[PDB]
Amino acid sequence: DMPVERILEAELAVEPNDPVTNICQAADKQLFTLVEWAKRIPHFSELPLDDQVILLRAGWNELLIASFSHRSIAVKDGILLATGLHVHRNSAHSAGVGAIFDRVLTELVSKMRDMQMDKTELGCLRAIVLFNPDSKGLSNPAEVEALREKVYASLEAYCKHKYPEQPGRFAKLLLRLPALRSIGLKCLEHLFFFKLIGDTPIDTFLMEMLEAP
Amino acid sequence: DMPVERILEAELAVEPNDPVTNICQAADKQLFTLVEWAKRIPHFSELPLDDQVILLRAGWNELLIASFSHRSIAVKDGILLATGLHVHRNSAHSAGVGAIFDRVLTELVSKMRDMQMDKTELGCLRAIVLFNPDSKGLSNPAEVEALREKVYASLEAYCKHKYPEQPGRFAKLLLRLPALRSIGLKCLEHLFFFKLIGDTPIDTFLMEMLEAP
Amino acid sequence: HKILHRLLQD
Amino acid sequence: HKILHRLLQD
Ligand SMILES: C=CCc1cccc(-c2cc(/C=C/C(=O)O)ccc2O)c1
Ligand SMILES: C=CCc1cccc(-c2cc(/C=C/C(=O)O)ccc2O)c1
Numbered sequence: 001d002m003p004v005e006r007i008l009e010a011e012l013a014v015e016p017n018d019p020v021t022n023i024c025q026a027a028d029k030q031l032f033t034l035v036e037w038a039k040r041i042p043h044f045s046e047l048p049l050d051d052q053v054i055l056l057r058a059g060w061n062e063l064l065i066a067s068f069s070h071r072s073i074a075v076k077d078g079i080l081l082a083t084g085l086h087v088h089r090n091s092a093h094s095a096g097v098g099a100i101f102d103r104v105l106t107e108l109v110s111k112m113r114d115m116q117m118d119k120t121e122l123g124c125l126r127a128i129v130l131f132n133p134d135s136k137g138l139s140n141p142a143e144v145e146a147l148r149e150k151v152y153a154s155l156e157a158y159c160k161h162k163y164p165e166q167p168g169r170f171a172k173l174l175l176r177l178p179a180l181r182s183i184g185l186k187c188l189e190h191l192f193f194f195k196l197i198g199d200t201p202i203d204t205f206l207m208e209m210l211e212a213p
Numbered sequence: 214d215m216p217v218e219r220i221l222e223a224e225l226a227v228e229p230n231d232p233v234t235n236i237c238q239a240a241d242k243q244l245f246t247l248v249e250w251a252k253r254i255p256h257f258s259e260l261p262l263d264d265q266v267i268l269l270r271a272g273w274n275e276l277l278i279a280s281f282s283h284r285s286i287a288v289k290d291g292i293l294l295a296t297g298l299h300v301h302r303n304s305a306h307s308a309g310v311g312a313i314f315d316r317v318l319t320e321l322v323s324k325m326r327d328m329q330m331d332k333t334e335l336g337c338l339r340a341i342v343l344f345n346p347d348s349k350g351l352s353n354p355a356e357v358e359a360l361r362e363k364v365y366a367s368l369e370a371y372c373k374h375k376y377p378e379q380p381g382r383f384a385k386l387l388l389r390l391p392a393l394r395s396i397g398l399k400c401l402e403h404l405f406f407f408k409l410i411g412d413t414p415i416d417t418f419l420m421e422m423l424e425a426p
Numbered sequence: 427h428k429i430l431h432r433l434l435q436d
Numbered sequence: 437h438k439i440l441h442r443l444l445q446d
Contacts, residue, residue, distance in 0.1 A: 035443040052444050107347050134320050134392055152384045171365045174387045179347055181391040185398060205439050248433040265434050418429050 002042055002150040004158045007123040010040035019087045019095040020200055024191075026081040028206035030064050033082070041127055043147055051138050058135040060209055061191075062184040063126050069104060070122045073113040077105065100186045107179040120162075121173055124155035129177065137213075215255055215363040217371045220336040223253035232300045232308040233413055237404075239294040241419035243277050246295070254340055256360055264351050271348040273422055274404075275397040276339050282317060283335045286326040290318065313399045320392040333375075334386055337368035342390065350426075 014037045038056060039045050045052075072079040078088035079101075092101035112122075131148035133141045152174070159170045166172075194200045195210055202210070227250045251269060252258050258265075285292040291301035292314075305314035325335075344361035346354045365387070372383045379385075407413045408423055415423070 032443065035440070039444075039446070049441065049444055053440055056440060056444075128388070148388075149381050149385075152388075153381055156381075156384065168362050168366055168369075171369065171383075171387060172362075174384060175341070175361075175365075175390070177388070177391045178394040181394050182398065185395065208437070208439050245433065248430070252434075252436070262431065262434055266430055269430060269434075421427070421429050 002147070002154045004120055004124065004154045006040070006042055007127055007151075007154075008120045010037050011119045011123045011126075013037070013040055016082060016084075019091045020097070020194065022081055022083055022085050022087065024194065024200055024202050024206060026068075026083045026085075027064060027191075028203040030067070030082050031060065031205045031209065034060060034063055038130060041130065044130070047143075048139055051140070051144070054135050054137045055130055055132060055144070057209065057213070058132055059129050061188050062129050062180050065104070065108070065184055065187060066122065066126050066129070066180060069108040070112050070117065070119070072109050073117075075109075079104065079109065097190060100183065100190060103179075103183055103186070107183065108176065111176060115169070115172060117173070118162075120158060121155065124151055124158070125173060125177070127151045128155075128174075129180070215360070215367045217333055217337065217367045219253070219255055220340055220364075220367075221333045223250050224332045224336045224339075226250070226253055229295060229297075232304045233310070233407065235294055235296055235298050235300065237407065237413055237415050237419060239281075239296045239298075240277060240404075241416040243280070243295050244273065244418045244422065247273060247276055251343060254343065257343070260356075261352055264353070264357070267348050267350045268343055268345060268357070270422065270426070271345055272342050274401050275342050275393050278317070278321070278397055278400060279335065279339050279342070279393060282321040283325050283330065283332070285322050286330075288322075292317065292322065310403060313396065313403060316392075316396055316399070320396065321389065324389060328382070328385060330386070331375075333371060334368065337364055337371070338386060338390070340364045341368075341387075342393070 014033045035056070038052070047055075068079055068081065071082075075086065078086050078091075080086055087101075089098070089101070089105070092098055128148055128151050131144050131151060133145035133148060135141075135144070138144060155173065156170045159166070159173070163169050191206075191210060195202055195207070227246045248269070251265070260268075281292055281294065284295075288299065291299050291304075293299055300314075302311070302314070302318070305311055341361055341364050344357050344364060346358035346361060348354075348357070351357060368386065369383045372379070372386070376382050404419075404423060408415055408420070
């Protein structure tokens, strides 16, 4: 089974200077929370430890981007980090990351706010991203797929129930994943330049995710 | 209205050495076909000429990648170009593009073959990609969105009708778009290195798509 | 810019 | 490799 109730539980259970330093700081901090969040997802812990690692290494960037995007829907022209510091449009632009920051605001944060995406819908979307069968190295790509399918079956149902008014609400949720994939890649690239130039402190767990497959 | 019948018409109306040279050659060739294909899409030609340009410049790479992926479902470990030349796993690997080529085979070509995605479903997906409201510069982002919504309303209906057996078939179609976005970015990067190094001939229309926004 | 604009004008 | 493996083992 794949109950939408326990997915939201996973989301609830994990609720709590220089923009870039704060960003690297908050990303390392949230990586611990992501592990705990992942374990509270149905059928996840019952996957072989090696594939749990592969999925978490494949999706961590998009999973964290989704979280702070939804977290910032009640914020004007800026994002709320997990450390508790706000990063606004000007501060990010003055840091040299205004472009990718703007994409997050328009393609993600604003779109979430304007459809009033709830924590259940956010939860399912992050579960769909976590259960990525395209991930290379999986011992059982078919089973991950089986789990993803059961996530968006439960999500479509919840939508048609909770929002019977909106018949395309289910499709609108899934069609944010392309932008999320796109934004994740660009954010990741920004993260790599930081590490390479190495003038920004990068703590150990974040450092571990940025190193070779 | 947004009839699935005319979308398939758009798809039908446009049916017809060194791997990389052939690839650049076929991509320029197909860019002309893409324009004609685009015009045969409902409500497209009625958009302001400037936004038609923006949408076509935003999506051309993914739109062309979708086409030859579906075209190659009846091919073993390789892709069928529009020029008519096959590029197989070894030839692409010997060209230095085996990685991105493998991603296309597993994430796209195989997935299309194994769900037996039809030309109507392919058509709608390419229409959804064409009607991208996230595209920067659009004079009316809301109207493009309105058209995209009417594309995947017609697609969900067609699926539930043509494949009532498969309730998650609609969601399986949309969840290939993340991979398509991801693969497009990497292919585009490969295209840029070609142009920069400039040892591979690049014809004028392809050359035009690779130049500044 | 122009090749695309031309083709769309028909 | 290990920080992730540890945390998953609980
Ligand atoms: C908003 C865009 C700026 C940016 C640039 C590079 C990386 C990130 C990034 C930040 C986080 C922070 C997590 C949190 O506080 O919740 C996570 C992943 C990222 O790629 C953001
Ligand atoms: C299959 C992957 C190799 C590769 C590498 C770089 C670019 C492309 C590419 C090819 C086409 C060809 C069009 C066609 O023949 O239908 C279009 C876009 C691309 O990014 C492929």
